[PDB]
Amino acid sequence: DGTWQGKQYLKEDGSQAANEWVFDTHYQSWFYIKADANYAENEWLKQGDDYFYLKSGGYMAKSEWVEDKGAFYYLDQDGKMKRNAWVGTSYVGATGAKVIEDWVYDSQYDAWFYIKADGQHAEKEWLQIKGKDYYFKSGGYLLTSQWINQAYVNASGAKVQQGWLFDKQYQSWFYIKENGNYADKEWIFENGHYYYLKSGGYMAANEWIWDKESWFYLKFDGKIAEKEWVYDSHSQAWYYFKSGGYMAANEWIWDKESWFYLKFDGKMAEKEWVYDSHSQAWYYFKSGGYMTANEWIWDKESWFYLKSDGKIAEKEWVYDSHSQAWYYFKSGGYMTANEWIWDKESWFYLKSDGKMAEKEWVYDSHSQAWYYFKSGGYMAKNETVDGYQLGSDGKWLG
Numbered sequence: 001d002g003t004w005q006g007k008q009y010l011k012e013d014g015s016q017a018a019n020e021w022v023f024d025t026h027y028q029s030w031f032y033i034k035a036d037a038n039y040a041e042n043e044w045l046k047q048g049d050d051y052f053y054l055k056s057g058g059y060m061a062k063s064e065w066v067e068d069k070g071a072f073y074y075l076d077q078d079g080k081m082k083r084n085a086w087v088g089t090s091y092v093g094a095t096g097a098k099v100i101e102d103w104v105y106d107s108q109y110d111a112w113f114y115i116k117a118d119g120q121h122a123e124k125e126w127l128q129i130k131g132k133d134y135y136f137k138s139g140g141y142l143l144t145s146q147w148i149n150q151a152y153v154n155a156s157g158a159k160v161q162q163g164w165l166f167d168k169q170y171q172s173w174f175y176i177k178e179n180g181n182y183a184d185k186e187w188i189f190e191n192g193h194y195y196y197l198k199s200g201g202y203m204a205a206n207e208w209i210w211d212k213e214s215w216f217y218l219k220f221d222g223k224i225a226e227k228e229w230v231y232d233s234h235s236q237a238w239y240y241f242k243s244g245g246y247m248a249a250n251e252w253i254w255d256k257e258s259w260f261y262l263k264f265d266g267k268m269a270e271k272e273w274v275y276d277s278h279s280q281a282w283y284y285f286k287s288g289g290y291m292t293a294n295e296w297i298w299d300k301e302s303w304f305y306l307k308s309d310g311k312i313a314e315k316e317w318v319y320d321s322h323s324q325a326w327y328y329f330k331s332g333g334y335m336t337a338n339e340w341i342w343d344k345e346s347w348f349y350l351k352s353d354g355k356m357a358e359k360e361w362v363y364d365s366h367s368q369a370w371y372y373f374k375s376g377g378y379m380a381k382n383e384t385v386d387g388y389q390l391g392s393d394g395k396w397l398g
């Protein structure tokens with residue numbers, strides 16, 4: 001072909017070569033003869049948008065790296081420099097410089113990679129990049145919008161930390177803890193409200209939860225129920241929950257304007273009697289749970305009176321202004337009727353409807369006699385009324 005003459009290259013025709021590539025077969029290499037008829041060495045050449053590098057001796061660098069003032073560049077088989085391409089496990093940017101410690105998006109793979117301190121791309125490992133945690137699978141691809149063991153990586157590949165996320169395929173809410181794993185059997189406070197995450201992390205919604213000593217109920221949106229009533233259509237009963245969400249059970253509660261009482265199991269007492277154990281008295285609740293107080297109730301063959309404060313009237317007298325008469329209640333609240341009783345110092349008779357005899361003549365069929373009672377129900381015994389004598393025992397003598 002041609003003949004080397006020092007730095008010069010005389011071609012077949014004598015004319016020394018310049019501004020041209022020549023392939024010499026002895027050296028088995030490409031060389032570039034500059035414009036000054038010398039071969040290029042230890043320098044870059046720009047031809048088109050292509051960059052070549054010619055090593056000591058003029059040999060064109062091909063399939064190898066070339067360090068330019070700290071930065072590293074790769075020259076392919078044709079001697080050309082590479083751009084936005086993978087050289088094995090490393091990456092060259094649009095300037096052809098080796099990327100080290102930075103993010104990389106490759107449109108060919110439609111994925112993200114991170115190049116590490118060693119110039120290699122991360123693979124099958126967790127890395128903490130400027131605070132956040134990212135995961136790369138086999139091949140270096142960055143994982144996005146999915147679950148890894150107990151963590152979730154958002155659409156950006158970052159691990160979620162201290163956040164709420166909704167899985168549409170599971171149809172449940174999860175809270176991701178500060179540590180990166182989801183909450184598991186614990187209470188979480190979010191914007192003024194408490195939520196309970198269940199054994200799988202699934203947020204508890206419309207269900208009962210037992211913590212340490214009492215019951216909690218979680219509503220439609222998973223919020224703890226507190227300071228309110230909830231009707232259990234399964235259990236067919238009303239429950240109440242207080243300041244902390246604690247269901248109240250074996251204790252009393254004021255709501256609307258009525259006292260209420262909640263039984264051992266948190267069921268509101270309704271249409272029934274209850275016996276307080278620290279008050280040692282009986283109480284009765286209407287249909288709807290409302291404490292009856294100062295009003296009559298008819299249970300089984302007996303009338304009862306519950307006074308201004310709701311306690312049962314028993315071994316005591318009561319005036320009832322609505323019916324305008326006096327009544328007496330025995331041991332147990334049993335209102336007395338068609339009976340005598342000894343109180344004060346005189347006798348008292350209570351009519352069939354329970355009303356005490358007050359200012360009237362009454363025929364006791366029992367003793368077959370006519371008795372009279374003065375204002376206040378006091379039987380008359382040794383005196384005259386309307387010219388009618390009365391004996392030592394109260395009977396009419398005549």
Ligand SMILES: C[N+](C)(C)CCO
Pocket residue numbers: 044051068073095096
């Ligand atoms: C110095 N390089 C030629 C390698 C890059 C500048 O374009």
Ligand SMILES: C[N+](C)(C)CCO
Pocket residue numbers: 004005006007027039057058
């Ligand atoms: C072939 N080289 C360019 C290396 C030397 C010729 O003198």
Ligand SMILES: C[N+](C)(C)CCO
Pocket residue numbers: 021030078079
């Ligand atoms: C270096 N070669 C001449 C072989 C290719 C440049 O286009």
Ligand SMILES: C[N+](C)(C)CCO
Pocket residue numbers: 086088089109121139140
């Ligand atoms: C982009 N990968 C690292 C997966 C391939 C390198 O050739």
Ligand SMILES: C[N+](C)(C)CCO
Pocket residue numbers: 103112156157
């Ligand atoms: C650059 N990343 C996409 C990897 C994270 C920020 O969005």
Ligand SMILES: C[N+](C)(C)CCO
Pocket residue numbers: 147149150170182200201
């Ligand atoms: C969906 N998670 C796997 C995060 C919880 C169930 O185990």
Ligand SMILES: C[N+](C)(C)CCO
Pocket residue numbers: 164173190195220221222223
């Ligand atoms: C706890 N979240 C606020 C995420 C759900 C409300 O229902």
Ligand SMILES: C[N+](C)(C)CCO
Pocket residue numbers: 187194211224243244245
């Ligand atoms: C049980 N909680 C933590 C939900 C309430 C405390 O007041």
Ligand SMILES: C[N+](C)(C)CCO
Pocket residue numbers: 208215235265266
């Ligand atoms: C006894 N409660 C109704 C409160 C809980 C049922 O699981």
Ligand SMILES: C[N+](C)(C)CCO
Pocket residue numbers: 229238255268288289
């Ligand atoms: C107060 N309750 C909700 C228990 C009943 C009202 O009708």
Ligand SMILES: C[N+](C)(C)CCO
Pocket residue numbers: 298
């Ligand atoms: C006193 N009542 C009429 C309500 C009941 C009769 O058994």
Ligand SMILES: C[N+](C)(C)CCO
Pocket residue numbers: 252259276279309310
């Ligand atoms: C029923 N009361 C609330 C009136 C007293 C019970 O402690």
Ligand SMILES: C[N+](C)(C)CCO
Pocket residue numbers: 296303322323353354
């Ligand atoms: C229920 N009693 C009959 C006791 C009185 C009603 O006015």
Ligand SMILES: C[N+](C)(C)CCO
Pocket residue numbers: 273282299304312332333
């Ligand atoms: C009928 N009371 C409930 C008032 C008493 C039970 O012995």
Ligand SMILES: C[N+](C)(C)CCO
Pocket residue numbers: 361370388396
């Ligand atoms: C004077 N009595 C009222 C006792 C009887 C008259 O019928």
Ligand SMILES: C[N+](C)(C)CCO
Pocket residue numbers: 317326343344376377378
């Ligand atoms: C006060 N009464 C006369 C109404 C009965 C109890 O002594």
